[PDB]
Amino acid sequence: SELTQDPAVSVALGQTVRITCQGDSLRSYYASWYQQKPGQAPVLVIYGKNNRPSGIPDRFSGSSSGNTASLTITGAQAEDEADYYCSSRDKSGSRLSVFGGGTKLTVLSQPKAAPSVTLFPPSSEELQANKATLVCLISDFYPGAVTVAWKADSSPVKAGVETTTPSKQSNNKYAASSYLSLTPEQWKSHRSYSCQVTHEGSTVEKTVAPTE
Amino acid sequence: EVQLVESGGGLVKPGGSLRLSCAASGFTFSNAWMSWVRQAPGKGLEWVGRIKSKTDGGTTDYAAPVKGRFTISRDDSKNTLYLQMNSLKTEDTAVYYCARTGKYPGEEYFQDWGRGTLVTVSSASTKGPSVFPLAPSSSGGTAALGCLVKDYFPEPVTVSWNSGALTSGVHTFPAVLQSSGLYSLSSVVTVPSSSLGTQTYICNVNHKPSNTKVDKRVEPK
């Protein structure tokens, strides 16, 4: 990922928010910016430097400094809630294009809520099928953005991990799921496994052990 | 008034081939650069490649993961852009977007985007789910329990609890497509810990494609 963005930011109605993109190619080129709402295709918001297409209001503006590019929204409105992506060349002189990882912008419409986390060890029945899945379920959080990290014996592990993007609950908060697939032998060979969930800069941990 | 409409997405096996089309109007097609961009379910945008206008040489450039496997071409007489996808891989599963591409060295930007068409790559055929309990045991007054629905194909699976009588606190998550080309999902419910000895909790898993229904009673360890 030659272009890097923060995964998530939030803003209150009427306030100003800045989303930043970083990469070596931004020293040579402007970044363009794209807005994508759930279930819709992207739309261009800024191109060149601070060119807003027709239909894009003035409150969106672009700027750049060194190897960074920034999208600023002044006076955030509910309709500005979306994922935002930057794009530019991957390096100077290249004929290729790349995107940043995207930033989820939440326009705050309900209280910030910390996730409830439950980590399920592999069921005995699944082990009988010669498989082992740790299931980390994450619910009731807002804004709908988390990062999930797994540990085995207190050290990081991220092979065999699959994580769903947060989606809405019936009560309008967010939930997400993460899976760590192991062999039965891997599962019974370690002392502990942990699911670490970071939300709004705070991290909670749940741990399970192949004993007890 | 600019219109871009992608078509041709479908289910295809690894190693197979698939041809996407993007039909365009509302701009002078022959003078436009045109790109493809893709997005795996729940993930970010990834540039696929771009073809220049005839006046600018008509040449193509490709992202490293697809170079040598996909071909971008255009038929200006039909206002149509194509993506010929060969040697398909499971990691190519994504919505594929067509984008009119502006230019001004200088970078390129994506002026207009289509709706997208979905490409799913898997070697699997119809396969019913295996259902495993996510059992509660020793969050305060409440406990979470659920059902893990593993390795089915194709989508969808639906899940209810107690034949629909239980809805409060229920959440069924989106499915994950694994490298195996099979899907898995989970469903969870949060209930009062004191009900675990009073109320029975059964997840009802329906997989219409395989003519399968599974009921799993979930009990504490």
Numbering used by the authors:
A (entry chain L): 2 to 9, 11 to 95, 95A, 95B, 95C, 96 to 106, 106A, 107 to 210
B (entry chain H): 1 to 52, 52A, 52B, 52C, 53 to 82, 82A, 82B, 82C, ...
Question: What's the paper's own text on this?
Answer:
One such antibody, the 10E8 antibody from donor N152, is perhaps the broadest of all HIV-1 antibodies thus far identified. The 10E8 antibody recognizes an epitope in the membrane-proximal external region (MPER) of the HIV-1 gp41 transmembrane glycoprotein. Like other MPER-directed antibodies, the 10E8 antibody is able to recognize its gp41 epitope in the membrane context, a trait that it appears to acquire during maturation, as this trait is not present in V gene-reverted germline versions of these antibodies. Here we combined an additional round of NGS from the same January 2011 time point with structure-function studies of germline and mature 10E8 antibodies and of their maturation intermediates to approximate the developmental pathway for the 10E8 lineage.
